[PDB]
């Protein structure tokens, strides 16, 4: 695993180009996340 940028605990990937996209985030220590919900699902075919 890589390291966080010095003086930071994560990275935020802010969408430039695509106006409708939300952010993505990266952590570099597994202890910085807890898997709180497991969601089981199907994708739905548009009508």
């Amino acid at each position: 695993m890589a390291h966080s940028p010095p003086g930071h605990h994560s990275v935020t990937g802010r969408p430039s180009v695509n106006g409708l996209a939300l952010a993505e985030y990266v952590i570099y220590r597994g202890e910085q996340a807890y898997p709180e919900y497991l969601i089981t699902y199907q994708i739905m075919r548009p009508e």
Partner: protein, 162 residues
């Protein structure tokens, strides 16, 4: 040490987690190549993941970060998709779940858009799709995502051509 508790669809917690799943679907620039073509999900089950060891591991690190950032963990709830969600819920996140080829280097990646995490359920770029039908847009096969509590602390802002 993990146990999974089923939430009832009548439970406010089930409903708020479903709304976050459904309301953060978007269209993707790949036209559905990786994740499939859809506007919404059929939620089949939501389970609470309960593991004392892993929770304590998380809260210990969260306090370290908080103390390095004026008592602010900058905690978010974010989605994570991976073929290894079964290992994650039993053993936690670690270096094996790092995306070596990611845009922001070899870390563990999370998304606000549930449909972004959905692109990774069957592997990088959707892999070869579901195991049964080899279809990245399978409407039959059950998929799984994690909705995760994530400590960001002080986060480095990368403006990104996404």
């Amino acid at each position: 040490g993990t146990i999974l508790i089923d939430l009832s669809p009548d439970d406010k917690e089930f409903q708020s987690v479903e709304e976050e799943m459904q309301s953060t679907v978007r269209e993707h620039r790949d036209g559905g190549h990786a994740g499939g073509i859809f506007n919404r999900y059929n939620i089949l089950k939501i389970q609470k993941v309960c593991n004392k060891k892993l929770w304590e591991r998380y809260t210990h690190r969260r306090k370290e970060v908080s103390e390095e950032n004026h008592n602010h963990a900058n905690e978010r709830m974010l989605f994570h998709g991976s073929p290894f969600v079964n290992a994650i819920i039993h053993k936690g996140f670690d270096e094996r779940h790092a995306y070596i080829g990611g845009m922001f280097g070899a870390g563990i990646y999370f998304a606000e858009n549930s449909s972004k995490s959905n692109q990774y359920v069957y592997g990088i770029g959707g892999g070869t799709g579901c195991p049964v039908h080899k279809d990245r847009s399978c409407y039959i096969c059950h998929r799984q995502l994690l909705f995760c509590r994530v400590t960001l602390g002080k986060s480095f802002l990368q403006f990104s051509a996404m």
